[PDB]
Amino acid sequence: KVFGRCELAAAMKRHGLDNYRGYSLGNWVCAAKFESNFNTQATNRNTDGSTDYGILQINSRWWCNDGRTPGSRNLCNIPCSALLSSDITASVNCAKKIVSDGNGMNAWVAWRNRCKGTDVQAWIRGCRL
């Protein structure tokens, strides 16, 4: 599923991402925009042989099992395919563990390089929330 900006913001808000560990909704929408272009089905293989999955491009090295990332962990206790669902519940729940892991949203390289230190609340402008 390719979400709308406001459609995704609403779904993120409902699932408790707004101001989660201090990160406004605009930080999450910006991240999803630059990680996946709001596509739940997005996959990107990494040179370490891990893969990034879904709307927030969660990595198979630590967070989910895809059956082909050797010596990887599965800290969100989920198959990576779950992160590709049109329902973002598993992506949101897993993102809450990630952002709680010590480095905040710096865990998302596209957030650090394209959202952090920008006017992120721009990403929810015009949205009924």
**Binding of Na ion at residue 60 (CB under 5 A)?**
yes
What 8-state DSSP symbol labels residue 34? H
84: nearest Cα among 29, 33, 22, 36: 36
Q: Which stretch binds Na ion (CB under 5 A): 4-12, 34-42, 55-63, 119-127?
A: 55-63
**Binding of Na ion at residue 65 (CB under 5 A)?**
yes
Shortest Å, Cβ 7 to Na ion: 29
Residues found in the chain: 129
Q: Is 7 a catalytic residue?
A: no
**Binding of Na ion at residue 43 (CB under 5 A)?**
no
Does 119 appear as a known binding residue?
Answer: no
CA distances from residue 83 to 53, 62, 86, 128 in whole angstroms, order as listed: 6, 14, 9, 26
Do residues 104 and 31 touch, judged by C-beta distance below 8 A? no
DSSP one-letter string for 51-95: EEETTTTEETTTT-B-S-STT---TT-SBGGGGGSSS-HHHHHHH
Choice from 72, 91, 99, 115 touching Na ion (CB under 5 A) = 72
Shortest Å, Cβ 80 to Na ion: 7
**Binding of Na ion at residue 27 (CB under 5 A)?**
no
Residues at the interface with Na ion (CB under 5 A): 60, 65, 69, 72, 74
Summarize the annotated binding site for substrate as residue ranges: 101
| Residues involved in catalysis | 35, 52
